[PDB]
């Protein structure tokens, strides 16, 4: 390895992945298999790539003393074991879901997804981001307005009104 120098290094880089970062996910990894790497790196073949890293650096004293890149509320985000997930290029969307549906398949605990940076706070996995470049959800979102929400109430009596 090395000393204080190797230390700072991993941080400034790992933490520039939080400064220049598109997104951030904190996932405790008890019982982490190599299949684990074989996943976020498989979901990197034909859907991601090297635009993502996830260095288990719960070195804390490291990854944390080294977020003077402005990462408050992360002392609370420093408990137990974690595997920092940081985005550089691409949207912040897809990356979150990957773990969301990984850990839910068992694939090691997800630290109840303690949440992370970008919005900046605590725990509560949302779905803002992943619904993007699927704007056909805004095609289906208009709900035909005048027509679909029509053929559902203005036209739902007959199929349920002759009682």
């Amino acid at each position: 390895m090395a000393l204080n120098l190797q230390d700072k290094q991993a941080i400034v880089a790992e933490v520039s992945e939080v400064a220049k970062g598109a997104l951030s996910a904190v996932v405790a990894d008890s019982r982490g298999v190599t299949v684990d790497k074989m996943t976020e790196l498989r979901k990197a073949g034909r859907e991601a790539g090297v635009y993502m890293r996830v260095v288990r650096n719960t070195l804390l004293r490291r990854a944390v003393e080294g977020t003077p890149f402005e990462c408050l509320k992360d002392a609370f985000v420093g408990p137990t074991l974690i595997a920092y997930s940081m985005e550089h290029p691409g949207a912040a969307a897809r990356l979150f879901k990957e773990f969301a549906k990984a850990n839910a398949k068992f694939e090691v605990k997800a630290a109840a997804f303690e949440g992370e940076l970008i919005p900046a706070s605590q725990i509560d996995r949302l779905a803002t981001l992943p619904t993007y470049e699927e704007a056909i959800a805004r095609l289906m979102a208009t709900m035909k307005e005048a027509s679909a929400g029509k053929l559902v109430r203005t036209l739902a009596a007959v199929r349920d009104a002759k009682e």
């Binding site: 035909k144 027509s147 053929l151 036209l155 007959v158 002759k162």
Partner: peptide, 30 residues
């Protein structure tokens, strides 16, 4: 047209016609 017009027809317009009507519009789109 006046909203009140489509209603009076979509509500009145019999049912021997209506249940074969409002259902038909449910058999055309969506």
């Amino acid at each position: 047209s006046i909203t009140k017009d489509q209603i009076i027809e979509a509500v009145a317009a019999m049912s021997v016609m209506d249940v074969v009507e409002l259902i038909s519009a449910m058999e055309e789109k969506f």
